[PDB]
Design a protein around this nucleic acid. Structure first.
Lengths: 463, 456, 463, 456
RNA sequence: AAAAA
RNA sequence: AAAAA
RNA sequence: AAAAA
RNA sequence: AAAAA
């Protein structure tokens, strides 16, 4: 004899999709970021970064004579040889922004793929300017400019959407890969910033919509997931830098500012402050000219008429000779070398290889943090020791992070409601931080939350 | 056969003043600050603080049952028994502000001196409320008070993590002795005034014999971020949220009136009614309001007693946590404070997953307070709370702030105070950069030592 | 038409075994260790520890009135309710040693299982003495004494082997669970020590043999896997303590030594040193009497005739009154309270609640480390501050770790050659350290190397 | 009407000596140690060291092309130009041992003084080899040397990370000035003798005016572990292995002769032939052997030149790494050292997975050396090496060692040296526990300052 | 770099 | 959490 | 708390 | 990497 135990309504499945999340670089370390998203047999590569400290430990630096495999053995750059064991063909290369941890390895690995590079206008410009700077013949991927808010079809089954976000470089995007079974979202090198000083407010609405439409997997950075609270706004750094530059009873002293050439919002703030304190803003260093110049040409920043930009050593040295013999109090040199890079303008000033002589009382403002690696900490120590031994006053860490804190990740997780989460852009320790946060959010390790190592592929079969 | 020459000096003259800088407390540690400035035989005492951590290591606090000498043996409070060896008489007791590290020992030591207590209005109010006896004189920033035919005291406005904080300048016939401790340059305060740089420069040109100044954050690079920074960060944490109807608790220094001000303003700007909870909140904020230092919105609610507080939390819980912004005590996980009691479930307020707890304060770097803070945060986290930490800006001068202070006052002698010998070491390296020499024009004093400064 | 592509010789499989590695407690934190090894449908529980700091954060301590579930909610103790979702029956409970992070939760959870407790003689003694110390009625598991080197049959298919190892408590073992498909080895709270001061030299031969016989899975601690090199021998701590106690030109000063009551090798060394410096070794504190007394009765340590042991408050206070009024220079008090435990002898001396008064010059030797938790760091700070304020001279950290370092794990891995490795006894951060080491040894995460969280079961099907 | 009384003192007497303690270098930093002790108008210089990190921040080392003044501007070496303001004449230059932080600046500054260099035999040997000019006098531990009718210098044996290290006692008609820097109490040395506690106590009772002593590890709790501890740990690392035929490299201080001794002994006990590689290994160990301080087994091999070294490594590689124990330079990842060259693959020796690299040294806490060490270890690890770090014991006295030193010598005045102001702060807290008072009997000197001590 | 009731 | 010419 | 060739 | 009575 037999009783009924109830009934189960079974859902339909009009599209099965096989998703691959391939960790190539930047899952075991910082710098050489590369991820590959496989939809069935088509592959979208996301970012191709470089890791600088692996270049610095070798007294040979070179980095432009060495080709891909030697750099991979140093790594340095992502080991993409594993792509030969991935069951698909690369259809596109997305670069979510233009800093070296996302495009630094483009000129070394991108030319081997039969795919266009898709990026934002500013990013595309930086990639182009960089590709045209190796002159080894000679294949160049075409570059498609895709703006935040725009969508691009790659395949009958694959579309790529850019969503604007904030970061320490302008024009940074989340990328959503739409598949017949739903979306794969990539959100790395980002920060929620509700009061940006240059870009736009993050697209929380679209994030929520995506959440409701269906997100299969989220690949997101774990870099500062261990840091408590929310990332302070860029406005905070704006305010602090303002206070450091204007708030002084020793006004006619002579001040040098140094920061990331790629941090366009920061540089912008600095030149405005120069205009508010009666000094002539003069930008020094090749990379200043590259990044800030490019940002200006494409209309991302406005520059005052008296702004001066110098890229060549003799232009720079003669500009510093002009400043030195006119009164340091009349200029605000905005220059490269905050990490004590050998050869940068500030490092050359510190060695006295320059008409500019730092004298007691002079104020040097590092609008940047020291990167937690022994190499750059050494270069910074030597730089600072020299500058102080010549009597300079050091203003350090006038800066705000470009990365999401724990609660930023919390809210992102609540908005996108991803089915699977994969931490990226960090060490396994950082991923451990992220994992604990995500578990608090209801995710389970090995189930809906996944710890990948470089070279590993997560297979997801969506019904 | 051999010769040389020398001019001899004449014994002719073309009232001498002897200065003593007596370090009493707060030169070997944090908290129990007390300095004594002797002009020949008249003495001005500056500040009388308490050190809380030396009270915490003994589980039996009752800081009002113990008399002065036992507190000194714990210390806790400054050892002023050394004043029995100082060749002078105390003519005044100056308190540069009203926080416990400047007035905490007032009720235990001040009564032994036949001298008035001189302080700013707010400070005087807190001292009065605290006593529950020296005369108390209210002296405002910018005003001068004569103490003796030869001695006057000037208050100069400055900024700090408590309102109405002053530098004090002791004017003598030989020049000024300046005391600048527990201070911060802030050119964009959210409460009070910008410090008096003009007067500092004037003083410098008039002649400063000695500067007694804090070394607390002399080790920190750069300049102290403005209170405006903490204002902005707190705004971002409180308003910048897609988890809006969650229920938020803010905790901070009850004495940081500027901060509490910012918080209640934000409460009015996020459509929650601000409820201030805890006895000390009632004390400091209440007093600040009565004296017209802070303005409060009509809907502001304050509860100091245990049952008032618990019934307020029962009211809040059963009306919607999303409708209130409780501003409460317990940011250091103080046993008995409102937040610590909420965390222990001894309260109608129950923390549930998602609730946001904002510590508008840093954790005090002492093992005791780090323990209490750890236990508190662990409990709150285990009940599902989301912790926003360090939404805060320092109340103390950084290295370059001291650089500029030194270059404005141009003192003949400098003495670091308000810290450990390590903090003083930082200050010393900075001052050496400015041209001072240790043991000559720069002096590292320990508690109990008297520095003699003579006229050339 | 058809060609042959070669042949493949296929192996036989005369016994399939399903293995479960269940992480119950101590995989997300320190202290409350509990693991469960499932062979088909029979379960061997390994260790049942407590986490002390979770008790300390509550101002209520109690820990003996509270029953299991409240302790689990604090946790504190392992959440073994998950055992109701594990497909098997518990046949035995192994305790690899007698310290609280292995037997601290025995009296709270063991009585719910219909299984005997298997342990070494010393461990068994401590478990018995502890069980007879709750007097709540009243079920007591029988305890089987199994010595290092001995094997015990539990099932037609399951045998348990003890292998001697070293640790900060005497009589510690690796446990090997022999199954028809091979062995599961558990090696937690251990240290290679080639010159022990009490136990035996580790059984490297047997480890190698096991390796060759076939190890399915290794569960091993990750606690100090991050620490570089090899764990220093106990002999090092012996030497340092000797030097601290004898090497002094201020000989008749009065010295107090404090250490782990359970560290029998250490205490032994101390009383021998007392005999070598003409002082009477007097042991104070209830737990000293418990652990050292027990170790003496079972013949693990020899004690000199003049040794004195006191467990009660009045015996202790009058012993200190005797010492105080006879000359501190004539005694070596060996007492509890190295973590500044409220109520311990040293903590009571520090509060002046004792005939013993510490005076300037007096030397207090902490033969122990400070546990990296804010609670115990607070208690230690208060204790030390009081002792120094009474003029004592503090000798700290005269101690050597009880846990394997990175290279110790390296060699263990090379000896056992396990098919699968699972890190245990630590946070996810410690496990991350272990994971990197194991990857260097050839293991692969998610494949032969497994990261478990509390409540998770790894299923292994051995052919 | 009113009265009191006082006894007046007589102007009768019931040769005065003025002591100057001049801090020249090594009081604000590590490395460039130099002190000058003035007795009225005769001066004894003690030590002349170099500071390596100030040389490293400039990539252009050549420390022999630069003359004294440029090295002083880098400093690098002590600024002894201040000696032009000191009212006295240098009668002797004492070097308490032969490591670079005591003799590194000898070839740059010693030649300007009309005075002999006095040192222990080994120290004299290293100075002589280094010079490639003052007279050099060898003075042994336990011996005394007359310098002046009023001044004698006594050497007292002590222990340290280099052999033949001494305390120096300067005897004057008013008592002794004792210098105890770069030292360690070690009652179980593996080389040399136990320090002379008897003589220290004797000195104490005879009368010590001033003690100049290191503060380097005064912050570390307890007592310095004996060199025997490092011996034992090194034994455990080298012999205690189930990975026996792997190939092992040991690196340590070339000047730490006791350590190298232990290592070669262990090499003979593990059936490997000890090969010492590197120029400085050849210098220090060679010199120590010739003078009979260390004994070497018959099979010992030493190579100082580049091709000798490379061909030795080619020999080793092609005979079996398991048969050799290379003892080489480069523990701090010094560019050009043997280990750094092996790590860069510029060498017949190739590191392969499993190889054990033993650093019998700690990493020096400076960003430069931490960088070099990081790059080195990363390379070695990337070639599969297993790193055994910190197999080492400190060469400097801990807090309680200083406690007992102070209680033995009973000096009237104490001056910390050989460290930063932070290290001195640690020492100061310890000395205050011992009864000394800062600015009175306890003195914190900076480079360039002269402390005057008069007779009562 | 502060308390808390 | 970044380079630099 | 030290260099290295 | 541990308790304590």
């Amino acid at each position: 004899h037999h009783h009924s135990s109830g009934l189960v309504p079974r859902g339909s499945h009009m599209a099965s999709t096989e998703i691959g999340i391939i960790a190539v670089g930047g899952y075991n370390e910082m710098g050489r970021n590369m991820t590959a998203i496989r939809v069935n047999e088509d592959i979208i590569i996301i970012d191709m970064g470089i890791r600088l400290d692996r270049v610095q430990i070798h007294e040979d630096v070179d980095t432009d004579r060495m080709h891909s495999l030697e750099l991979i053995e140093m790594g340095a750059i992502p080991d993409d040889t594993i792509m030969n064991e991935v069951n698909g063909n690369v259809r596109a290369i997305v670069c979510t922004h233009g800093a070296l941890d996302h495009i630094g390895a483009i000129p070394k690995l991108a030319h081997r793929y039969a795919a266009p590079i898709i990026a934002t206008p500013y990013t595309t410009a930086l990639i182009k300017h960089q590709i045209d700077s190796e002159r080894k013949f000679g294949v160049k991927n075409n570059i498609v400019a895709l703006k935040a808010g725009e969508t691009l079809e790659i395949t009958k089954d694959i579309t790529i959407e850019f969503i604007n976000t904030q970061h320490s470089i302008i024009d940074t995007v989340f990328v959503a890969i739409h598949t017949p079974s739903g979306a794969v979202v990539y959100a790395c090198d980002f920060k929620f910033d509700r009061t940006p000083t240059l870009g736009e407010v993050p697209d929380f609405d679209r994030l929520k919509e995506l959440g409701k439409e269906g997100v299969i997997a989220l690949i997101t950075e774990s870099t500062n997931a261990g840091r408590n609270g929310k990332t302070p706004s860029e406005l905070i750094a704006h305010m602090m830098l303002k206070d450091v530059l204007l708030g002084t009873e020793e006004s006619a002293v002579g001040m040098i500012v140094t920061t990331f050439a790629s941090h366009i919002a920061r540089v912008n703030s600095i030149v405005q402050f120069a205009q508010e304190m009666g000094r002539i803003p003069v930008l020094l260093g090749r990379s200043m000219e590259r990044y800030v110049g490019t940002a200006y040409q494409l209309g991302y920043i406005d520059l005052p008429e008296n702004v001066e930009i110098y890229g060549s050593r003799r232009d720079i040295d003669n500009a510093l000779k002009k400043i030195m013999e006119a009164g340091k109090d009349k200029y605000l040199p905005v220059m490269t070398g905050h990490q004590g890079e050998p050869g940068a303008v500030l490092g050359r000033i510190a060695n006295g290889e320059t008409p500019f002589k730092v004298e007691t009382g002079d104020r040097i403002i590092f609008s940047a943090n020291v990167i937690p690696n022994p190499m750059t900490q050494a270069n910074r120590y030597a730089l600072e020791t020299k500058l102080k031994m010549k009597g300079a006053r050091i203003y350090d860490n006038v800066h705000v992070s470009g990365h999401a804190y724990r609660e930023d990740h919390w809210e992102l997780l609540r908005m996108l409601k991803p089915e699977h989460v994969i931490p990226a852009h960090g060490t396994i320790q950082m991923h451990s931080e992220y994992i604990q946060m995500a578990e608090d959010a209801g995710y389970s390790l090995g189930d809906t939350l996944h710890l990948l190592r470089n070279g590993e592929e997560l297979y997801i079969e969506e019904d």
